[PDB]
Amino acid sequence: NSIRYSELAPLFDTTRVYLVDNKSTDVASLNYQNDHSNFLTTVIQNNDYSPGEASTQTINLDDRSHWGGDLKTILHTNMPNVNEFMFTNKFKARVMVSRLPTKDNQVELKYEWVEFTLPEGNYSETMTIDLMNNAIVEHYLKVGRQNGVLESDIGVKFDTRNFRLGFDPVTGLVMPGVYTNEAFHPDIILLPGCGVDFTHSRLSNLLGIRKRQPFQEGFRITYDDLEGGNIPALLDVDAYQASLKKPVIKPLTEDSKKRSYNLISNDSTFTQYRSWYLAYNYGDPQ
Amino acid sequence: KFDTRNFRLGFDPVTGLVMPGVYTNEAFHPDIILLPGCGVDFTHSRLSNLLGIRKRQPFQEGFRITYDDLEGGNIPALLDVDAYQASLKKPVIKPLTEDSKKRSYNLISNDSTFTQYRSWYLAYNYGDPQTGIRSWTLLCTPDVTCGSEQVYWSLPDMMQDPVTFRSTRQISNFPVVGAELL
């Protein structure tokens, strides 16, 4: 029972060897490249031999018995909500590239996966969602509007509200004429032939969308997989009360500035906007 | 001039000017805007961590960050809004020089779109990640406390000398018995 300090005088059982981070500056010659993650420190602490010293001297422990004490550390980080390190800044998502007229009467539609990038800093779950969509817009303002695709058929859009609370089982349209303004839970709205990649993104968990079997690599979720979750179109309100036969059946096609909701046909009530929240507890659970 | 907002959210990759005509009013993360030939020293200041700007190698003394080091982060000038809608060729290309009370934004020239205002936030994830500022800095969480510096405790006339510590009488080298976080 004696811990040798080489000099001074050995102390008996129950001793303390501190390993602080305030000693890195003094060791100027070892941590001259690494920042607080894998730095070297002097667990000597004599108090008169200047900053760094006693590199050759070792804190002895007897050969007859082995020691083994506690380790009550004190960690403290400052890692942002989004950064290149944790892989939360980038997230892929196949969006429309162009859409012109070629072949005479044909209409070719091209789609290509594009890796997006978010800025370092901004926190809060709502603010991150708005930024994920802000990246979808900046992509359109550099490739989209210059080639062909309109502001209407913009693929990929993250939301939070339930697009089926005002839906009536008879008419088939959202009677309020406006989707209920009240968020419930984040998801991923998609248009024909477009999805979102999350194999190299932890932003999937943030939205609250995990796989029942996370051990399988590949979090691909295209539009073809969201069968049975069509967003019910709105009801023509300015026509329903005006006429008062009744309009009812007639859904809202255009609006202010004129932007078509992309209806599947002239007869049906649903649109080409597949929702994730609606495909969960509203579709077929089998 | 210390700021907090992103001066590139309304920026269009075609015209090269902030289309909204006004920088987006929504803070993201604190930084340090600088003009030609001027910087900020932080060798003897803990206010650097507060802004959320740490060096990847904090063991090297000297947190100098001049204007010459912020290459590739020019703040995109605003768009002349009162001229764009009024004319409606289109103005577009013409950036906003003056404003109310008349104060020039300090444009580098009469042809280009960028100004002489180098931004730190724009030099991080928007510049070149191989030779820019993102090489020696880091976008960390603000943290108001400045840091988690741990104090030391001691009781010389009672507790034995902890392993390598030695006996003396000065308030700058007392035998530490146990360290705690402030």
């Binding site: 607080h36 070297l40 667990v43 422990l61 380790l71 980080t77 400052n78 009240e182 | 969480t141 976080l181």
Partner: protein, 101 residues
């Protein structure tokens, strides 16, 4: 040491209609007309990260036959690599006898 701080903003939805005025440019809400391409309704109870300096309790760990002068404090991550976001990282060790040979 990253936590979740539960808040409560009853201003939600009602602050959205006001934030479009606090800010000078509708960046996020570029399509205030379309009922699908609009701005996502601000959900109630906003969660934001908060770096809280932890104070764990690690169990007993055997020591070497001769402790070095210059130790090496490392803090590995999940993918086995450096975490450039460590502000403070110190440790206290109180060795004791376990068993003879």
């Amino acid at each position: 040491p990253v936590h979740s701080k539960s808040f409560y903003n009853d201003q939600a939805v009602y602050s959205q209609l006001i934030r479009q005025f606090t800010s000078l440019t509708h960046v996020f809400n570029r399509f205030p007309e379309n009922q699908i391409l609009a701005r996502p309704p601000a959900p109630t109870i906003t969660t934001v990260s908060e770096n809280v300096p932890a104070l764990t309790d690690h169990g007993t760990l055997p020591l070497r036959n001769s402790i070095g002068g210059v130790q090496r404090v490392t803090i590995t991550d999940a993918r086995r690599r450096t975490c450039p976001y460590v502000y403070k990282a110190l440790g206290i060790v109180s060795p004791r006898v376990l068993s003879s040979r």
